[PDB]
Design a protein around this ligand. Sequence first.
Ligand SMILES: Nc1ccn([C@H]2C[C@H](O)[C@@H](COP(=O)(O)OP(=O)(O)OP(=O)(O)O)O2)c(=O)n1
Ligand SMILES: [Ca+2]
Ligand SMILES: [Ca+2]
Length: 341
Amino acid sequence: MIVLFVDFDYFYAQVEEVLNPSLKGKPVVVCVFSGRFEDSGAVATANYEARKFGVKAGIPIVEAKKILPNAVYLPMRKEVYQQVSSRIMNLLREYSEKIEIASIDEAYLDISDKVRDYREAYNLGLEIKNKILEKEKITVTVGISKNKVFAKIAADMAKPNGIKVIDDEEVKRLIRELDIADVPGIGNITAEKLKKLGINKLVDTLSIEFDKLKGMIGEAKAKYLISLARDEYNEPIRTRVRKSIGRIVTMKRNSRNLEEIKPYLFRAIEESYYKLDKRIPKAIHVVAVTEDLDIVSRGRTFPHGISKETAYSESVKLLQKILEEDERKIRRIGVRFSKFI
DNA sequence: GGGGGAAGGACTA
DNA sequence: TCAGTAGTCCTTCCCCC
Ligand SMILES: Nc1ccn([C@H]2C[C@H](O)[C@@H](COP(=O)(O)OP(=O)(O)OP(=O)(O)O)O2)c(=O)n1
Ligand SMILES: [Ca+2]
Ligand SMILES: [Ca+2]
């Protein structure tokens, strides 16, 4: 198999640059303003001029401003990036019917039946980059290898605005030399459990007793890592279908007062129903983020679709279940719909 | 023994 | 006054065949 992975460069910030070119060359920071106070919230992403200085996705907006007080701070306009993303995905469909859209800014193409070798895949990759640049003026990074995991890794190594092929020989070198923390799906917590087992490279998972590996990181991740280490990882490129749609909002102030929380919960339901658009969910979950940032949730599944009115009344019962079963105050409240008809 | 669901947890956004 | 904001898949514990 030959997989071609496309990951758009600093996506949210780049789309803003495309819509307002005077922004180019300046540090741009796209933010999610929570509304609790002046500048409360987090950075969604920043272009490379801002990232060079430590302003990156996830940090508080107040911290970003301490580092770069004169950078351009823009409010996230998700719907705008979504429309731009959808047009780029449509361009990629022209290069392969076998495409897997993994997120708002990334897709995997199985080009096995389109090119004969890596030389040709690499060329098709250039063709793709040029096409996206021509049509939307957006630069992307392309990663090419024998499977999804290594195609993604290839891209990670070449961004931004890059293109890289990890051939079979390099795949073998990487299995031995690549820091296992850099493997998709290995976060800080798993990375720490592995370091604690002596495991720092994929190749290391082949010599550890399987039960020891599994007992520590679970059966699924152990098999995943082993399959990659044996160079036998095979997952087909598959059309993704959204399985849930939801919205969670931050409250002006923490609380466990039902009438005070209702307005935020109802606003989350409205926005959520706006996004479902024709999709009818049979399940609804109320999700609360507690004062200490823990996540607690309660849901219900119906043998039929959930009308907006039913979503309103059931969400309150589920919220009450959360209040009655957890004594912490709530900071964020939202809903999540799933099991679509 | 293991299918199947609810809720927590990890990961990547 | 650090802490957003969406969404997926796996795990653990429980019911049930
Ligand atoms: N914690 C995060 C991480 C990402 N995103 C959003 C904004 C990013 O623009 C977009 C894509 O994610 P990437 O990790 O690919 O980040 P970028 O495209 O921004 O940059 P790059 O790919 O250059 O590294 O997803 C977000 O809202 N919150
Ligand atoms: Ca990406
Ligand atoms: Ca990207």
